[PDB]
Each structure stands twice: as structure tokens, then as C-alpha cells.
Write an enzyme that holds these catalytic residues in place. Sequence first.
Site, PDB file in Angstrom:
ATOM      1  N   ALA A 154     -29.130  12.511  79.264  1.00 33.70           N
ATOM      2  CA  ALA A 154     -29.638  12.271  77.939  1.00 33.70           C
ATOM      3  C   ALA A 154     -28.397  12.262  77.212  1.00 33.70           C
ATOM      4  O   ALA A 154     -28.007  11.212  76.440  1.00 33.70           O
ATOM      5  CB  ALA A 154     -30.640  13.030  77.426  1.00 33.70           C
ATOM      6  N   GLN A 188     -26.165   9.119  78.308  1.00 31.52           N
ATOM      7  CA  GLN A 188     -26.751   7.821  78.001  1.00 31.52           C
ATOM      8  C   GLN A 188     -26.884   7.322  76.375  1.00 31.52           C
ATOM      9  O   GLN A 188     -26.365   6.528  76.136  1.00 31.52           O
ATOM     10  CB  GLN A 188     -28.043   7.833  78.510  1.00 31.52           C
ATOM     11  N   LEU A 247     -17.149  17.681  58.908  1.00 33.39           N
ATOM     12  CA  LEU A 247     -18.174  18.284  59.514  1.00 33.39           C
ATOM     13  C   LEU A 247     -18.668  19.617  58.751  1.00 33.39           C
ATOM     14  O   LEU A 247     -19.876  19.676  58.845  1.00 33.39           O
ATOM     15  CB  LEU A 247     -17.724  18.665  60.782  1.00 33.39           C
ATOM     16  N   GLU A 263     -18.839  19.854  55.861  1.00 34.51           N
ATOM     17  CA  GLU A 263     -19.842  19.465  54.462  1.00 34.51           C
ATOM     18  C   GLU A 263     -21.146  19.420  55.024  1.00 34.51           C
ATOM     19  O   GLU A 263     -22.064  19.568  54.111  1.00 34.51           O
ATOM     20  CB  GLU A 263     -19.114  18.287  53.953  1.00 34.51           C
TER      21      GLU A 263
HETATM   22  N1  LIG Z   1     -33.724   9.558  74.455  1.00 36.89           N
HETATM   23  C1  LIG Z   1     -33.493  10.044  75.865  1.00 36.89           C
HETATM   24  N2  LIG Z   1     -33.931  10.836  76.448  1.00 36.89           N
HETATM   25  C2  LIG Z   1     -33.495  11.155  77.790  1.00 36.89           C
HETATM   26  C3  LIG Z   1     -32.554  10.192  78.377  1.00 36.89           C
HETATM   27  N3  LIG Z   1     -32.466  10.672  79.884  1.00 36.89           N
HETATM   28  C4  LIG Z   1     -33.295  11.874  80.014  1.00 36.89           C
HETATM   29  N4  LIG Z   1     -33.766  12.188  78.643  1.00 36.89           N
HETATM   30  C5  LIG Z   1     -34.712  13.284  78.506  1.00 36.89           C
HETATM   31  O1  LIG Z   1     -33.937  14.558  78.745  1.00 36.89           O
HETATM   32  C6  LIG Z   1     -34.827  15.248  79.277  1.00 36.89           C
HETATM   33  C7  LIG Z   1     -34.685  15.273  80.991  1.00 36.89           C
HETATM   34  O2  LIG Z   1     -33.106  15.966  80.788  1.00 36.89           O
HETATM   35  P1  LIG Z   1     -31.729  15.157  81.345  1.00 36.89           P
HETATM   36  O3  LIG Z   1     -30.812  14.873  80.326  1.00 36.89           O
HETATM   37  O4  LIG Z   1     -32.214  13.870  82.125  1.00 36.89           O
HETATM   38  O5  LIG Z   1     -31.149  16.138  82.526  1.00 36.89           O
HETATM   39  P2  LIG Z   1     -29.801  16.700  82.772  1.00 36.89           P
HETATM   40  O6  LIG Z   1     -29.027  17.340  81.381  1.00 36.89           O
HETATM   41  O7  LIG Z   1     -28.899  15.638  83.300  1.00 36.89           O
HETATM   42  O8  LIG Z   1     -29.855  17.931  83.611  1.00 36.89           O
HETATM   43  P3  LIG Z   1     -30.190  18.048  85.433  1.00 36.89           P
HETATM   44  O9  LIG Z   1     -30.617  16.708  85.936  1.00 36.89           O
HETATM   45  O10 LIG Z   1     -31.601  18.819  85.321  1.00 36.89           O
HETATM   46  O11 LIG Z   1     -29.274  18.659  85.801  1.00 36.89           O
HETATM   47  C8  LIG Z   1     -36.276  14.521  79.386  1.00 36.89           C
HETATM   48  O12 LIG Z   1     -36.759  15.195  78.244  1.00 36.89           O
HETATM   49  C9  LIG Z   1     -35.968  13.266  79.401  1.00 36.89           C
HETATM   50  O13 LIG Z   1     -36.922  12.322  78.728  1.00 36.89           O
HETATM   51  C10 LIG Z   1     -31.878   9.241  77.772  1.00 36.89           C
HETATM   52  O14 LIG Z   1     -31.443   8.240  78.035  1.00 36.89           O
HETATM   53  N5  LIG Z   1     -32.560   9.195  76.316  1.00 36.89           N
END
Ligand SMILES: Nc1nc2c(ncn2[C@@H]2O[C@H](COP(=O)(O)OP(=O)(O)OP(=O)(O)O)[C@@H](O)[C@H]2O)c(=O)[nH]1
Lengths: 159, 64, 437, 431
Positions: C12, C15, C252, C254
Site C-alpha cells: 500500500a 503503490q 512539518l 506547523e
Molecule cells: N489504497 C490502497 N490500499 C492498498 C493497496 N495495496 C494494499 N492495500 C491495502 O492494504 C492492506 C494490505 O496490506 P499490504 O500493504 O498489501 O501489505 P504489506 O504491507 O505489503 O504486508 P505483507 O504483504 O503482509 O508483508 C489491505 O487493507 C489492502 O486493501 C494499494 O495500492 N492502495
Amino acid sequence: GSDLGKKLLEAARAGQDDEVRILMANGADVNAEDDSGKTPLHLAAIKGHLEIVEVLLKHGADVNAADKMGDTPLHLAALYGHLEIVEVLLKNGADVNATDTYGFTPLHLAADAGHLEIVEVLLKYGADVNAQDKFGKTAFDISIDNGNEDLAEILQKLN
Amino acid sequence: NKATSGQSWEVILKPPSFPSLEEIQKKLEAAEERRKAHFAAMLERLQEKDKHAEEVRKNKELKE
Amino acid sequence: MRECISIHVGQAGVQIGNACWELYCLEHGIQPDGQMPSDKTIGGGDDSFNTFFSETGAGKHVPRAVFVDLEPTVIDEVRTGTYRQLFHPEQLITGKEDAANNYARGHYTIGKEIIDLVLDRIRKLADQCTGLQGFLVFHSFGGGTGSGFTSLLMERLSVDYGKKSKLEFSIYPAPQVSTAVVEPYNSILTTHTTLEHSDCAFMVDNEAIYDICRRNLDIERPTYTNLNRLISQIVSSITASLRFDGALNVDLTEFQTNLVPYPRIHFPLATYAPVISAEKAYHEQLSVAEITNACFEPANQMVKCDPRHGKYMACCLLYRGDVVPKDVNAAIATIKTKRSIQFVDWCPTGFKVGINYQPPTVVPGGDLAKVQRAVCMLSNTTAIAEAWARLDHKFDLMYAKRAFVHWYVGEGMEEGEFSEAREDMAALEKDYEEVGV
Amino acid sequence: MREIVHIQAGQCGNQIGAKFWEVISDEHGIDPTGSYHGDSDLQLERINVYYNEATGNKYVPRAILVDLEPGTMDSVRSGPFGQIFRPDNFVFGQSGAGNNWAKGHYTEGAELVDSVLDVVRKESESCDCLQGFQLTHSLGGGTGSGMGTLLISKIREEYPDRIMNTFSVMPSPKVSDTVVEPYNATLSVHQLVENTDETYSIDNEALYDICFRTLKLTTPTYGDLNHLVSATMSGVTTCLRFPGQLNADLRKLAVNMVPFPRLHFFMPGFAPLTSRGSQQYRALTVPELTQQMFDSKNMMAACDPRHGRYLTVATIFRGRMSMKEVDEQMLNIQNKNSSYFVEWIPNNVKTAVCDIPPRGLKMSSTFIGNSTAIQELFKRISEQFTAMFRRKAFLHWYTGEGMDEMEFTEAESNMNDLVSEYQQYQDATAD
Ligand SMILES: Nc1nc2c(ncn2[C@@H]2O[C@H](COP(=O)(O)OP(=O)(O)OP(=O)(O)O)[C@@H](O)[C@H]2O)c(=O)[nH]1
Ligand SMILES: Nc1nc2c(ncn2[C@@H]2O[C@H](COP(=O)(O)OP(=O)(O)O)[C@@H](O)[C@H]2O)c(=O)[nH]1
Ligand SMILES: [Mg+2]
């Protein structure tokens, strides 16, 4: 007995009482053997299908028919614990002391399976208690090795 | 406040009415020693079954 | 001076980082190879975008960012993608095995193996700073890396960078897009461990973003690409003042001063407007009054909650584009007449307003329409406690049965940590309740 | 996560294993020579999970083939994909297990076990990042059952931090007549409860019933049963071998599926159900796939899911379909049937959609359920075990191998505790 022979074997394994009757009338062979040499009577004897056993016998089935391991339907009913079938086969001339390729008699198999009432009926009908399988085991030996106290008492009276 | 690429101010509608690093190492140490103690207990229980299977084999020879 | 290092943790975080850095480049006129015709070579290294981008001898602009993941697939896309020349290989860090949606695994088992390497790369970026302000940390609450590795990193950053500001952009879980049943556990464990280490955290509820994409952007089944583009717009609104010569939220520190009256209640609510579909017929641009009104509508929020069921303790309005002070003041006056914008007893009822003249920017073939004026309201309301209550309830349901607990205990975690984390959340809910009673 | 090491033990294990390799090779575009002849980069993205890349663009299954009997190994080599396997990976004895768990676990199996571990160690140490192991075996025989569980324990000893996954075929009197199957299955279940992380309960009772009742096959053969097993194995492994978000590896799957360590026995489901060479008229719709997927008639374990509650569910949809329609259909099932999903595990149903449908179908659905109804499978085996054990039937074949009666008592007790544990969570309330 072609299509009818395979169909008759299927109906005796499934316990399709009325389908066995329909196939006899159509001329299905009563002693039609399967892959292992089992006749519809061995299949009814494994699965516990009492009425099928009786219809097959009334239509001249071979009560002492041996499969490829040399087991008759009496060996199978004795192993699988079907008392009422063991009584029907016996009344219809089943060989109490029939021996398979391993030296097993029906008593050998009933003792190993722990079928107390079958052992009583087999002994009543003349099962030899001194018969030894190819492992050199009598039915008394089988019960002692299994740890079966009740059965070893039941067999000691003759052995 | 007037900056080069921006402007700011306040609108007041109404006034008020009226090294910790060593502990981190100690916590990670504890978790690591606990995870190893979990794995070592799984291993002792499997090493225990190995002894039972060598006992079974020695019992087979007591028959024939 | 006055540099900000961005840290992207897990899928997350990485991305969302991709989407943010793509948008920053469009805003500053930086090409995907790091080149920009607008600048001068040091020079040339004193304009506001320099807080986020360092400059090389070849006249290239490099994000002051580190991307971390315990598995390589997501970062492998960054190193093969359109912006592979934007980042240097040393700033893209990956392990081999992920945290398998287990906080304990991310924090205690796998995290311990890569922590020193991550801090070494952060340190190399900090060595290029003359006036490091602090860190912007992007991560999910739900994943084992995003939850477990983040809290481990936040603790170490407090040790290595003493009294240095740390802000978060945290992805709050939604079942429409969730990948783990254990997300509530990871969310509460990370919030407890990070609480004393974060100065200000902007939660992004995936359901709120999912609903805005469905309703405002006419996307039937929103993907992470759709969610991230929308997330980046809000992150850009929040960071515009650091990357351009602002007047509000200039540093930051602020953000903390303007939005956090007590260190624990540090979760501001972001509300953005307008969110308009690009595939729409020519329509008249929304006025300052219309976009300001949209700030007080729960449908435009980044977190699902009801501000009418809470009290405000701080409110910031960040305008962007063709915006005049006269129109802002009139809009604020009319809002008080139609809306119950109740503040706590101890805080003045008011707003800190900032206009950043830089136009709102959108990704060219994206889902968002380009607008003449936009606004992001940052408010610290007690209504955000509703998001903690929903998470705490899901935690309680599972925890009463100790469902899945063995997965954390197997990684070396103690059952008492779950209780400690939950008690801290109960104290947090109590703080929100007590504040403005 | 990356590599999975696959182990095939005994007649059933090797037959089901060989079918798995031919089905997945076709999906990944690999021919019987090991050459990739596919037309999609998605087929190769995660190829490394099941295949090693050898010299000259050939792909080799990371599979170990084990038996105490040589005949099965010959049958595998002689098979359509028989030439794809590593020759050094065939580990076989000369004297079988004689359908005796004790021979497979303690005697003949123990004599072969180190030769197997040397091959698994070679495969495992060659892995960049080993996820764990996948074993295919039956519980009713001697090798797959006894030696298969021995292997699990020996592997657990050397790789304690890796995931242990099994495809365990449960015996049924409908398909086999060997009287000792209840003893062999109970002794194996005792081992699986303690030593595996996840077990797919593939029930011959359910496979026979599907073939006879649904497919209208008067006399089902192992070929008919194995057609359902291979469809299931392809479906449950979809997430591991194609790029995707959900249950992408063995550990993420276990973390989502297993709330309590012992409760790791899954009830697999599949739709549409088809017969070897049936000319399937028209693809099914998303509501049809969803309805059938939760249907007792589509379960690969002979348990009625309406007799229990789902702790966790993984649903895999395959083919070109609306993700919106799938989400609506999946939410509808949960809302309508709220009482069959535990309230104390929120959002316990996870859905994945893979664009690639399996061979012969345009659209398919695979269900993986952790249901308290699986207790019916264990109760059926327990009752069959007890009937024999209480009469001291056939015990000398086991004790003759050096085993004591106490092991039987212990295995039975553990299986009954498992049943009791399922019942406890079935009755638990969110209160
Ligand atoms: N908005 C958003 N949510 C995301 C994205 N990728 C994953 N999530 C959310 O993040 C959560 C899953 O966590 P991840 O970030 O994919 O996992 P991680 O941090 O890589 O951890 P592990 O894979 O367990 O090692 C869920 O709630 C997903 O819906 C993204 O690109 N955008
Ligand atoms: N589904 C299925 N079951 C099989 C197959 N072969 C044997 N079985 C079952 O496996 C059990 C017998 O075990 P088996 O694997 O043949 O013995 P082993 O070689 O000693 O492991 C019984 O329940 C059989 O019905 C097969 O190809 N498919
Ligand atoms: Mg990840």
C-alpha cells in the site's frame, strides 16, 4: 454373460433387489464373474445384501464359487460381519472349511474380524478349529495375538 | 501571511468559552528467545516420537 | 534546509508512493527521467520543490524517498516502470519473504533482518540534508509489513532522529478490498506501538475512497490504481505547502501546531472537493462557496465518520487555484448559518485558511477532471473516534475467542501485548469522549 | 515465499499427483518434454512456484515421487507427462506396505525415509525462498498414509518454519473394500492434527456420490474420481501459481484460513461438476457459480455445510466475468445465510478472481471452506474405527509391527477431541 453379466454384478454390489430380478428373467448369468473372479453372490456377501443373496441362490447361484484369491461368499460374509448372510449360505450348502490362497478358512476371517456370533455359527456348522493358514495360525492363535479374551474362551472348548 | 506562491489568515468566528534503544533490544530479545523456546518445544516433541519409533522397531524383533 | 524524507512501507505504501511521486513530478514539471526545464543547476538548489527533491550534477531531480518491502514484486515494478530513472537503486529496498499479513512477523521476525539496512539508506538520504524537517511515512494498517515493519521503523527513527517530526499517511482497512481476516489485529497493534512516535497521522479509509470512486468517478469496481490516484490528490493538497512557497503548513511542525492540541488526539480528518469524473459533459466550474460547502459533507471525507456526532478542535482550509480571499470569507460566513460546526469549549470557533496559487493537477488519462479550484479541509474532530470504535469492535469479536492469536504467539509475541494494545485503544476512545464532553 | 516442494506418496498419492502435474502443466503451457509453448506471460510469472528452470528452456516439476512399491513409479514414468520428472526424484522400495499403516510408518517406511529426505533436502536447498511442502496421499492405505505422515514429521523436524500442506484422500467403503482403512485413516488423522498447517480433505465418499448421483456414472472408476480431484487441486492452487492479491502464498492462505491450530481441515468445493469427456453445454453465470459452490452436492468432503458454520471461506472465480457481479453475489450469500458464518470472525469470506479459466470451461468456481460440519467426516471414520477396535479386529497386523494398543486408543481420543473442538466453535456465540 456379456451386458447382462456386468449389469447383474452392478445390481448385486448396489443392492438393487428389483434390478437383479429383472436381469435373471432376461437371462443374466448367476455366476457371472467380475475382474477379481467375484460372482454377484460374493458382492451381495461383502455389502450385506441379504435378499439378493436369497434371490441369487433360488436362481441357482454357486454357493461355493471361489474368486481369484480363493475366497468363497462365506469367507466374505464372515470377514464383513454379516451374521444373517453367514446363516443363509450355511443352510444352502456353503463350505464351512473352504480355504483361500492364503490358507484362510471363514473361521480364520471371523476370529480376526472379532465377529463373536459368526464364530459360534461357524463352529455349530463344523468349522475346523485346528486349521492353519499359510502363516501357521489357527483361529485360536488369531484371537490370542489380537488380545481377544471373549473369543479365545469361545474357541478353547474344541481346540 | 503573504508568501510567494501563497496567502494565509485566520477567521475567528468566536472566542473560547472555557537511548530508549536498549529497551527496544530487550523487547526484541524476549520475543526471539520465546520464538526459539516455541520451536525447541516442537523439536523435543518430534525427537520424543523418534525415540518411540526406535522402541517400536526393537519390539518387532521380540515377536519375529 | 528544509528537507522532508518520504518512507513507503509495504505494498500500500509503495503503490501510493508511486501515485504521489507521479503527481509531484507533473506539479513541478519534472520528467520521468528526473529532468526539468523550469530549474537552474545549483544555482538553483533553493526553490521549494527542493524540500522533496535533491539535485545531481547532471541536472537531475531525485525524490528524497525510500521504498521498503519485505517481498520484491511491488518494488520490482518501480525499478522496471516509467519512473525507473527517477529513483536510484539504493533507495528501493526489498527482502525475499513477506510478513504474511502478520504484524508479529513484520515487527519481530522478518523486520529485524532488514531494519539496519533500511536505516542505513535513510541515513544516506539524511546526509544529503542540511536542515532535515523529518519524515512522511506511507503504510497500510492491515498488512504485516505495513503494520509490523512500520512500528519497528518509527521506534528506531525516534532514537536516531530525536526531536524530528514524523507524519503518517495510513491506509485504514475496508472489506471491499481487504486481503486478511486479521487486519483489525494488525491495525490495533501498529496504532498502539506507533502512537507515541507519530506526531500527526492522516488516515485514509479504503471504503471512503472506494465509495468516492464509485459515486463521483462512476467506476463500477474500483482498483488500487483508481484508489491511489484519488489518494495522491489528497496527499498533494496536504504537501503542496511544503513543496511550494506556502504561507500555511509551511513546515512539518506547523501541521502539529495547527491540528494537534494534545499529542495522542493526532488523527486529522481530510475532506477534499471537487471530485469530478473526466468522462463528463462540459459543466460550469464550482465556485468557492460550492467547494467550501462540500468540505462539510460526510460523502467527501477520506474517513467514514459523522462530524455532526463530534466536536472540532482545529480546522484548516487549504485552497488551490483561482481562489480570492473575499470569496473564502463570504463562504465561511454562510457555512456557519447552515451548519453545526461545534468546537470544543477551550478552542476558538474558527479556521486557519491557506490559498496555494498552484493549480490543481491531475494525471492526463486519469479518472479525475481538471478543475479551476479545489480545497482540502484538515480538521481534528472527535467524530474520527467512530473509525477506531469499528476497528476495536472487530478486534474484540475475534480476541474474545483468541481466534488467530496462535499466529502472533508463534512469532514470539505475548498474549499480553494484544491486551496492552487494546487498553491503549480504549484509553484513546476515552480521550476523544472526554475531550469536548 | 516462492518455491513449493511437492511430495507424492503411495498409489493414490502418485495417481492424484501425476494428474495434478498434467493439469497444471497444460495451464502453464508446458508440454511433456518440459518446453513452454504457451501464449501468455501470466503462465510464466509464477512458474517458479512449482517448476525449476533447467538448462535449455526446459521446466522441471519440483516433485519427489515416493512409494514402497516399484509398480506405481513405472506407471508414472509411462504416463503422458512421465518424462517431465527428474529421474533422481523417484524414490521407491521393493516391498510395499501391504495396506498397513504400521509398515508405512515404522518398518518399511522408516527404511526408505532417509533416501526421500536426501532428495527433499536437495530440492529445498536449491530454493531461493522456500514456502513449504505439499503432500498428496490417501489415508486408507499403508504408504501414503503411514509413510506420508512419517515424512511430514521428519520434514517438520528439518524445516520447522515452513508451511506443511496436504491433499489427503479419505477412505470410503463405497470405493474400497479393505477392512483396515478405518485404522489407517484414524492413525493418520492423529498425525495430521499435530503436524500439518493445512489439509484439503478429499473424501472418496463424496467423489463417489458426485459421480454416481450427479454425473450418473453407474460404476465410477478411480479415473472418474481423479477427474474431480484434479479440477479441485487446480482450483485451490490457482492463487499460488498466478499473479493476484489474495492467498498468494501458503502462509497468507493459512493465516486467513486457520483461526485455531488444530482446525486446519478444509472442505473443498467445485463448480461446474463434469464427467471425463462430458460435452459441457453453455458456460454458467456468476449467480449459478455462487449458488453451486456452497451447495452440499458440490463438496469434495461428504459433509453438509448447512449442518455447521463456516469459520473462514476462500472463494476462487475463474474466467472472464464482472467483478461487480461476483461481489454482489458473494455479499448476498453471506447476508441471506448469516447464521452459517461465525459472527465472531468478521469478514471471514475472501474472494479472488483469476482471468484464466481451466481447460474445457469458460467459467469456474472453487470453494475452500473451514466449516465446523467437517466433524461429520471425522465422526464417520471414528464410528467405523470404534466398531473394529471394540471387537479387537485385525490388531495383530499392527502390533506384529511393534505397535502397542495404546497408540490406537490415543489416535481415537485425539480424533474425538477434534470433533468436540469443532462442536465447541459451532456453538460459540459472539455474546
Ligand atoms: N489504497 C490502497 N490500499 C492498498 C493497496 N495495496 C494494499 N492495500 C491495502 O492494504 C492492506 C494490505 O496490506 P499490504 O500493504 O498489501 O501489505 P504489506 O504491507 O505489503 O504486508 P505483507 O504483504 O503482509 O508483508 C489491505 O487493507 C489492502 O486493501 C494499494 O495500492 N492502495
Ligand atoms: N481418489 C482416489 N483414491 C484412490 C486411488 N487409488 C487408491 N485410492 C484410495 O486410497 C486408499 C488405498 O490406499 P493406496 O494409496 O492405494 O495405498 P498405498 O499405496 O499403501 O498408499 C483407498 O481409500 C483407495 O480407495 C486413486 O487413484 N484415486
Ligand atoms: Mg506485501
